[model samples]
Target chain A: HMESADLRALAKHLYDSYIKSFPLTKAKARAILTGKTTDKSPFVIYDMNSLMMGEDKIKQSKEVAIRIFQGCQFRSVEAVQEITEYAKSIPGFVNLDLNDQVTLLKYGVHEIIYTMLASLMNKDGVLISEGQGFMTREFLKSLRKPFGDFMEPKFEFAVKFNALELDDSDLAIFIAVIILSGDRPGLLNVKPIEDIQDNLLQALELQLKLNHPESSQLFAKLLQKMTDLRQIVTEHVQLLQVIKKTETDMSLHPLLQEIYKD
Target chain B: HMESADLRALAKHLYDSYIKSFPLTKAKARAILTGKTKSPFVIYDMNSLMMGEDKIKFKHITKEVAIRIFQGCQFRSVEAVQEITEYAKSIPGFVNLDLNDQVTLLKYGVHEIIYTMLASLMNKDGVLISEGQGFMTREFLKSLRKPFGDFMEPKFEFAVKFNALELDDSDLAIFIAVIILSGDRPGLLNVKPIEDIQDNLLQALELQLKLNHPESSQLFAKLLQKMTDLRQIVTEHVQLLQVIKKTETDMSLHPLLQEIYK
Candidate 1:
């Protein structure tokens, strides 16, 4: 029953909150988190295409696996803070029904990370470490067992997903859709969350229409990417389960364990 | 700005029929339904027929026969019971329902499980497979009168409609699990966690429907929608118990079941 005027205004706030959660550009996010800005972007770009991956390779692969995860661990803490910060800003999200708020963030956090990680993706690889490091597709393919196995589907998803070329502005609205998702099961107050989601989707549609005239099914395609994102995240969780159980040599953060347990 | 992913994999695997052993679990369940060509039967328990007997000397209408089906519905179908446990074990987060709600859901939701499985043991024609070996004509079931046949109404009707969904082992696998972990099942102590599990499952099921059968994109939603009618059938319990008590221990059910039916 509400009109678009205020709807878009709120949507813009949601979008702006997303960008506010971190930085406008990848370089900025890295600068804030790692305190290093690249001349590295140049190397990251070249490295994405040029770097290339073997039992000593297996050993090297395991070490690379640890390295990638460790670097990701650094951003992961900020991710925890940002998603929380972003969630509360979604107008109605912080209002009440507190226990379930933990429920949504608990479930939604990693999925959001994977989505934004798309920003670093090149066609064949994701630039690593604010452009400070890179691992190629074939390079990941050679990493230990599941570590390599884990990387491709993600690269496959991100590489294709990034082609949609949504900047932070649209991602802001989309992430809100992800967080306010009424589809999640355990919600104690689903209708309110869904109403919020409904409003966002409407706002998002208006914005995408203004943005992508030539791109047909833009919203549909964008959400479809999310469907695949959920798809990959399940596999990754399982692989982590296997790695955690079958080989103790690898490790998980206490935070990761807390989330993984359920 | 970002998005979410793990849930889709759960949905994806469910659609594909390999919840790892979700596949084996369902395969075993479907295998149990007719048997591995082994003994055949997710078959009805008929001993608990005149008060129950299954040699097929079948009688037309006895209050005892009604009590028999009624009583058996309480034990809730042993094969369905076993597989429900197996289904929960194979599912990812079911055990996470604080353990107490696990039994609460299965206790309340088990009969719902049986009727859906009833589809596997039946056909669109008015006949049902008996002991998975022979057929029982509807004429026999249809002949049971008054307090008798009316008790049978929703049991058959629900199965018929469910079968009409034309869902397969994989699709029905999630359906069965969905009802068991159902968040909104009336008596859950802490519905939040269980509620969350059901929501995730629903998305899994909906994804299964959309990807596996584009013609049936929202068919999963239809399936969920149909379940409320399942609840309505339960709500209508007053009529059966009213008549039965008025006619009591003219052959009795276990005293405990009387309370449960109450």
Candidate 2:
């Protein structure tokens, strides 16, 4: 009973510190949410009669598509630094084996990104391009296969996640639990990670209990969401294989390729 | 550690069950992979069977095109009607109602329920992901004549805003039940019983919102305001449907719509 109050407050501090680790803070996230909801902020629209009519137009479209994907991946790479630094802030994360640290970040960043993306989302779409652009679901669908495919699941995951209505501190704990997961494939040591994982999980439960006294299943719902994230990651890897086979012009960042690799 | 006896957990179970009732399949993956743009009547990938990207510049929509779209969206909604019937049966205490009252609730509530589900398929950018397969553009729909073009905009607006509340599937399950078991639907024989059901559902939703959206002090009240908007949209939809009915006297209403409206 005595620990309950301290645990939730402890969780709050964790999130605040993690917020500081990111290039954009919680206050700035609020600014992005307000600054970004634009369908009228125009971009060029190109119509195609046939693949036969315009190589130049096709090339222009390709250039735009490539730039969008490149920007997305670069932003993803940026998130890794945020996650890595947040992990460093966790007690005992720095004491782990070097490979252990890499393994957790490798398997974990995408899930963290998906979770955090909810902060910048409405059910319509997500805010990216540094919170300057809104990518509608239709526009994403308009892109060629595999390129358009990933965002649908992310949107699904994100919109449902937004329902949790967590503040900055809650998310910091959620992200911590995601990184300290013990199931990543190449873990050299699981015990230490699990120890940290349990502590965060306990803190998280206390936080949810204190904040959501009326909800019986919030913790279970969160665990279910974590399981859902695992399936999305598996599907994401399969989709990447398809991109490897078919999307000849696009390139992934070296770090991303490795993170996505065997 | 958990109490499924609480209305909140039961509410979530219903939403989760509803989710499994409609599964997005992989066969859709390949057909849409080829870009289903050859047909002008069809729109976004999965939603393509309903609206058309090629029809965006409808300086004027012919009678044939207008009838086709009305047929398309309503035809798709029958499927929603059946699923919502299934959803109605899942609501605790819903099945215990007098059969006539049950039908009355379903009759009045189906449109609201379908529009609620449509939020999953819609974004504010005038796009419908059409249950994860294709997309539909709002401008594409706007090309139709009065009453027909006018029909979707309010529903679209309601969806975009209701989506902002970010209720997850579980919360939605209860909210949708609240839509059906509304005491005030005309001709309900045991209105008090249905109201009792709604009372519990509303209570569950309030507590669920408090738990999930701890920061948004006004979320529950904001949701009530949207309920008014949702009902207004439904009320206006019936008005437009009557216009469509009278003007296109040759076209037949879906038997269900005919019965419900009468």
Candidate 3:
């Protein structure tokens, strides 16, 4: 059995390795991520070794498909990247291969979503405060500046997956927040969870959608764990705010006034 | 003599009257006063007003010149109009007017500088945190996506005469604090003064400059007092950090962790 540090190192090393393996795919993802897009080429998925197989090639791509979904849980960007690496380090009995790992890291829903949200958050710091919607509307609004010219099409795609249960009011606040965050070229609009069409999910069907793929069991289990972590953190942020308020109210020196005096 | 309430009301009325008289030239000045100028306007003597008066009715040009100088302190647009209104109230003799009945508002030196800086702090809200000059430069470099590019140039022409004294980091911080609390515009920056500028008779020069302008005299004195209050506060901020550091070490938190918590 590997020690804790060893496991962490392996996880990080895998991520670094993946970044090196699919340089072109990473470049494309980064471009779309920064709000630019080029001609689309189909993403390749292989076994753990990341090599195409003879029989798999004949079975109209024998490569198994898998899905992994994670939600927001951390207060800062570093925590998110750390957890993402942690997720990658777990040795699976069988599932996505090396090529799949690269695909997963670059475009998998979990990885892509995390990177995009982090970028947008840092892009507009106050856009998503605790008291407001779980995060500020500015989070999504910041995407608009970068994606101003290309929002319509991808917007339709994002809304196809109702993953977050977001509402119209949430979307409106999101738009306003982004608008106020100032402009960044090529930002993409975020689609709320409730409005997304499941058919779109089906259209992008991959290992995540497949029933018999060896990757399904592990992916499903990991996805559930991530969802739980997210729920816990949301509750924790609320608790922290109450504690902060209490500190303010009970301080011998009034917090706001004291700070000003300083 | 009027009661304190009446004095406050009279100050309000005069300030309201000034607001009502805000000319486009004054608006341009306000923009500069707020540091929204693209380039620093060269400091011109009071004679510049005389030069500009040729464009107006020569008979009342002297009065126009003085009024124009006063008007040059208006700031640009705000996230909320209420902030602008409150900022107006911060001016001595405008909202509450100066304490001395003889002095009109906007003629105060430090107060004018405070007003200008605070407005700038407000305008940069979502996009920036102007810590100080170098801090501002670093932030500007990091932003990579800046909006509202101009810094106050025209208003600088009027106020440039006042920037005669240089401020250290810590003093600058105090300047921001006192002005923000007593006046308005949630402080345009997060700055701390480093050291006091070495000027034995700078205070005397400050007072003398305003004494030269009878309309600005009383307000200028009040401005000095306000800045003195701010400097003390800045000094206290440094002291408080020392106390907090001691407490943190006593409690076994790492120094780095204490820094992070802040």
Candidate 4:
């Protein structure tokens, strides 16, 4: 009985309203990537010179690493809060039991954060730190072994995903589908949550048909991207684990630590 | 207000009732896999298509049969999800949650449950499908074209390893309940009561497994670890379906398949 159109509109509204606070903008992203922007930012890149060798370089590199990951953590917290508020505004979300709400947010927010990140991404890679930080596929690969390895696959997925060229409306529904995923581990009332998800998905497919008339496969491709998103997030969590172990002086933010605790 | 012991009993009872109706048994599964049993349904190998005299006509017939076989399997899968839903409703606190929450749990948990149950229908070689009326060889399955072959390979891999645990009916029942009662899925309205139930279920399961497999303390840990395996397999399955939907336009994936995959 739920109207797909109404659901799509609602999802889009929620996305647009909350996504305004999304830290990154394209112009700002470029400024950050090219090292032309910001004051007192940890992500500042220092030129390598043979004169400044060994320990200082290593220390600088570690500082950069801390900056990059910490920046992600800070932005992720803001994004998670915004989206959680967005989720709360969804019709039935507040009606769910309090514990289920926390559990869903705990397990699902990281995936949603990455999904939203995919929207901000271009073929190059994702923009982070309110557009003050940019991560490229090549740059991510050059980082320490597994940590750098993590960004490459996620970039690969983002590149392919961005090729679909989903508009705000379509992207909104996709984000809704991601947020309302009934699949997190300890749900008590999955039926209602799934109903909302189903409606959102059906709306997404229909909107895709209208938006990309020539591409019948676009809807399915986007659905598949959700799977890719999950894998990428799982890998991200693994990278987080390694970062926690290897980068002892640095610590994950409380929000991110909670996210990775699972 | 549910006690841990009672929650465990409920979980165990739900599993027993659901699994007793499982169509495949271990002995029958082995017999089918070894070619000791003949099935009316056969998966047509593409290589065999070129060798036959009536190549075009035979191809058409086999293709029809093959599609029918796959579709029948899909149909059975929908029924199984429904059956599991019924079983979840029978669990004491499960039905007490919001209807939407119930749907969310089933929507997300069904695939994991199916993968977990699939361990029962597997031998070292392959799985029994269509209630043991069909056997698909693991190698043969891998040899099929993209999407079709990709779908089952992960499940087969998971099943073989999971079967190695050799959990009994009671252990499985509680495990299945744990899977269904997961509190971490997205969009849950209330996680506390659900998690309250889950904690007890885990306690009950741990106690039972410890008592049942006294010499193998790691069995419970191993069983819990299987959840990760199951999630990975489901992720692969969703990715494969995405590829199929994109490349194979003529193939009609079932609505339920698309629903879960999305």
Against the reference, the lDDT scores of all candidates come to 0.62, 0.67, 0.29, 0.64
TM-score of chain A of each: 0.82, 0.83, 0.21, 0.78
Residue B108 miss distance in model 3 (angstroms): 20
List TM-scores for all candidates, in order: 0.49, 0.47, 0.18, 0.48
Model no. 4, DockQ: 0.02
Order the candidates by TM-score, highest first. 1, 4, 2, 3
> What would you estimate as the lDDT of candidate 4?
0.64
Q: What lDDT score is found at residue B174 in candidate 3?
A: 27
TM-score of chain A of 1: 0.82
Interface Cα RMSD per model, in Å? 12.8, 16.4, 32.0, 16.6
Whose TM-score is greatest here?
A: 1
lDDT of 4 by residue, B193-261 (tens): 786667566667767787788876335544664576677888777776667668766556568756763
Show model 1 residue runs off by greater than 4 Å.
A24-40, A44-62, B1-262
Query: For candidate 2, what is the DockQ?
Result: 0.03
Q: By DockQ thresholds, what CAPRI class is model 3?
A: incorrect
User: Chain A of candidate 4: what's the TM-score?
Assistant: 0.78
Output the TM-score of candidate 1: 0.49
After the best TM-score superposition of candidate 1, give how far the Cα of residue B52 lies from its true spot, in angstroms: 14
- Evaluate residue B261 in candidate 4 and report its C-alpha lDDT on the 0 to 100 scale: 31
List TM-scores of chain B, every candidate.
0.69, 0.77, 0.23, 0.78
lDDT score, candidate 1, position A53: 27
Alpha-carbon deviation at A171 in model 1, angstroms: 0.9
